[PDB]
């Protein structure tokens, strides 16, 4: 074995695997590990048991990670050693980048990145090529949930809401694929996400209020709202059946405390239907924001088009909405 013959490791005795394959019945879902992985992990058990913080243990974690990057325990132990030994975290980041590029779908790598990057002593400000590395990941998988999650944390941590590369990178990704919902979600955070550092992080403003009012901004920048709505319309015109910009627009209007009827004419322009989202938009306008007579009937017409032609898999939801509108209109007629 590698470790068992290395004088570097002579001072410590490995702890052999105990899977229960000797006591009682045979264990379930076993894996016939390679001799290399068996030996490395046996030495890992030994150093962790002794709480050893050393250069040799650090190298060991790197070796095990090279065999199995989904080993959650080894990453956490590695982070402990790095801080305990006062290792150069810039060098650790450069190494981590290479691991990330080899294992696109691994999320443990990205929690580890957050742990390191959160250290103000080592990273007082946003590293000059950090955003570039994120774009190198997004160029390979533009919707990577864990990389987007890390980028959200990065924005909050370094206060990058108005940093031009955040909005620039979002728009570059939306140029490449306007249907990238992850980019739209990040855009909402940049523009409308809560920033108060004295509060717990939240996806929406006003979580302390009634749930129906979740998202409402305390103070509204009206020019910014107009600009974001105009941007949304422009992207919609590129591909009207794309749900993401319609959902974003609903989010912006909710945050701004503006009614969906601000887009009534815009929605109608797609109706010969070029967008089912335009139909759903009109249904809500006629049902929830229009108090005139006949408006309820028109909402039901829109929902009928959806359930019969334009989105029939969601028939039971459309019908639920119809029943709600009918009851509401009946209550209105009653009083």
């Amino acid at each position: 074995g590698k470790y068992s013959s290395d004088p570097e490791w002579a001072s410590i005795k490995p702890i052999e695997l105990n899977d229960g394959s000797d006591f009682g019945a045979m264990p379930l879902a076993t894996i016939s590990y390679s001799p290399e992985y068996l030996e490395a992990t046996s030495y890992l058990r030994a150093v962790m048991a002794a709480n050893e913080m050393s250069e040799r243990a650090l190298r060991l974690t790197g070796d095990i990670i090279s065999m199995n990057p989904a080993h959650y325990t080894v990453w956490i132990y590695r982070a402990k050693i790095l801080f305990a030994l006062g290792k150069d975290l810039n060098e650790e980041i450069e190494w981590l980048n290479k691991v990330a590029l080899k294992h696109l779908k691994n999320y443990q790598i990205w929690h580890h990145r957050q742990v390191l990057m959160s250290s103000r002593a080592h990273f007082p400000t946003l590293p000059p090529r950090e955003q570039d590395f994120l774009m190198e990941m997004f160029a390979q998988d533009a919707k990577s949930y864990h990389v987007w999650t890390y980028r959200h944390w990065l924005v909050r941590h370094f206060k990058l809401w108005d940093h031009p590369r955040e909005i620039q990178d979002v728009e570059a990704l939306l140029k490449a694929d306007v249907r990238n919902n992850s980019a739209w979600n990040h855009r909402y955070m940049l523009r409308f996400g809560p920033r108060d550092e004295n509060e717990f992080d939240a996806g929406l403003h006003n979580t302390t209020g009634p749930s129906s009012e979740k998202g409402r901004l305390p103070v509204v920048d009206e020019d910014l709202v107009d600009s974001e709505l105009q941007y949304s319309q422009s992207r919609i015109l590129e591909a009207p059946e794309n749900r993401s910009p319609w959902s974003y627009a609903r989010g912006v209007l909710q945050a701004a405390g503006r009614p969906l009827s601000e887009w009534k004419d815009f929605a109608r322009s797609f109706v010969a239907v070029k967008s089912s989202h335009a139909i759903e938009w009109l249904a809500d306008v006629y049902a929830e924001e229009d108090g005139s007579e006949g408006s309820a009937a028109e909402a039901v017409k829109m929902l009928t088009l959806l359930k019969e032609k334009y989105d029939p898999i969601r028939r039971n939801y459309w019908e639920y909405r119809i029943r709600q509108i009918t009851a509401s209109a009946a209550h209105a007629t009653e009083i």
């Binding site: 702890i15 695997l17 879902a29 076993t30 325990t73 996806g203």
Partner: protein, 446 residues
């Protein structure tokens, strides 16, 4: 086959001219699914029912699941930290298909004895630190096999102390000490807490107590509320993208805190949650996607599918011993699972073009089971206390196979009927009941 509606035999009507990676992947997925939905692919086995849907290949899936509990070659090293999950997925699948898994008691005990840490909790295996997901998997596995000896395996007090270390000042839970904080962590932690009847109070020396918190549930529903997004769905952590997987974790966790019709409308905006959840389902595929503009996946038959009984209970209210009914397409989901997600050699898959695995086998079957039952909460609980009282009041009635057409029909056959699963605990109701009741009657260790 005349029993297959046009809805499941053709691409959507509306088509944008602009082509991007998203539409290229979506188009390829639809094209792979179409011959299977139509029941004309040569990989498919019959018999086909009056709806044109192949039978659930019970024998093939049984053999697959039994084999998945045995030994794997060295190439499967990536699953080393997830071995408890592998035990759970297989036992769950076997239970669903109607097998008695009592005979696995001794082997389950042997597996998890080594993985339990003396400081508390269960990890992926010998020498791995405790993790809420491996503890969740181990507890559910123990629940399914049953028996006093399996129940006694867990060090309750140590588990309580360890779980206390995971409680964060913002109300959520990390998955392990030094690990990530996400709603998956909160859900797994609270299920373990509920099934073992752990004390509600945090350990007297828990770090979270320095942040004003006193119990495991303190600040928790507020944390979950801060995970809702502008889309209406729920993300893994605040500010992240809405995803079906985290929607289930969040909703199930809320329903562990009280009655669905009280807790869900209080902490979630149902007006935005409902259409987003509805929008998870595609035609012609019939299955659920996890997030906006991504692809259907058989495992979301559970993650998204089992959000529905929870949401519908929140709308209906507690049933004493009138419903909004099902707000999604049971026909569509059933078509996707049975027509598209069955592998000819056994096991179920994410989607056509993917190999089967025990994770996707477990959750596709779980989703198939949910469409076959009316799941509802009642005023009658098997718990002798009041904590998690609503969570142990869930009951079920069969939703029988249908005849003819309709918007809410059962297009599986009765030959395809699976055992009902608890919508929160994702094990049989009796299994969840037995383990909870047993621990309720045990004094907490000194």
């Amino acid at each position: 086959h005349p029993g297959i509606p046009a809805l499941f035999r053709e691409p959507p009507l509306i088509h944008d001219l602009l082509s991007t990676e998203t539409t290229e992947l979506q188009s390829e997925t639809v094209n792979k699914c179409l011959p299977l939905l139509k029941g004309i692919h040569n990989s498919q086995k019959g018999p086909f029912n009056k709806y044109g849907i192949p039978a659930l290949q019970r024998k093939d899936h049984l053999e697959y699941l039994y084999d998945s509990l045995e030994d794997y070659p060295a190439s499967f090293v990536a699953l080393d930290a997830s071995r408890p999950w592998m035990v759970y997925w297989a036992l769950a699948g076997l239970c669903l298909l109607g097998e008695d898994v009592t005979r696995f008691r001794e082997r389950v005990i042997s597996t998890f004895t080594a993985a339990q840490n003396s400081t508390g909790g269960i990890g992926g295996g010998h020498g791995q630190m405790s993790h809420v997901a491996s503890s969740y998997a181990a507890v559910l596995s123990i629940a399914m096999v049953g028996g006093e000896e399996a129940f006694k395996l867990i060090d309750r007090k140590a588990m309580w102390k360890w779980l206390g270390k995971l409680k964060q000042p913002d109300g959520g839970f990390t998955v392990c000490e030094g690990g990530e904080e996400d709603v998956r962590g909160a859900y797994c932690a609270m299920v373990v807490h509920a099934l073992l009847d752990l004390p509600l109070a945090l350990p007297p020396e828990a770090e979270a107590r320095q942040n004003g918190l006193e119990t495991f549930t303190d600040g928790l529903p507020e944390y979950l509320s801060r995970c809702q997004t502008y889309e209406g769905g729920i993300s893994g952590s605040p500010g992240s993208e809405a995803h079906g997987a985290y929607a289930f974790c969040a909703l199930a966790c809320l329903c562990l805190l009280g009655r669905p019709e009280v807790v869900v409308p209080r902490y979630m905006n149902i007006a935005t949650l409902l259409p987003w959840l509805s929008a998870r389902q595609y035609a012609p595929e019939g299955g659920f996607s996890g997030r906006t503009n991504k692809l259907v996946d058989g495992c979301y038959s559970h993650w998204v599918g089992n959000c529905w009984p929870l949401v519908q209970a929140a709308l209906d209210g507690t049933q004493p011993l009138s419903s909004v009914g099902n707000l999604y397409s049971r026909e569509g989901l059933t078509r996707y699972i049975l027509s598209c997600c069955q592998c000819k050699l056994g096991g179920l898959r994410d989607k056509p073009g993917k190999h089967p695995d025990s994770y996707h086998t477990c959750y596709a079957l779980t989703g198939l089971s949910t469409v076959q039952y009316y799941h509802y909460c009642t005023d009658s609980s098997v718990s002798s206390k009041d904590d998690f009282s609503s969570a142990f009041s869930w009951k079920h009635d069969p939703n029988f196979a249908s005849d003819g057409q309709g918007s809410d029909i059962g297009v599986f056959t009765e030959n395809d009927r699976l055992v009902p699963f608890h919508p929160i605990f994702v094990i049989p109701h009796k299994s969840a009941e037995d383990i909870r009741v047993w621990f309720e009657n045990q004094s907490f260790d000194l």
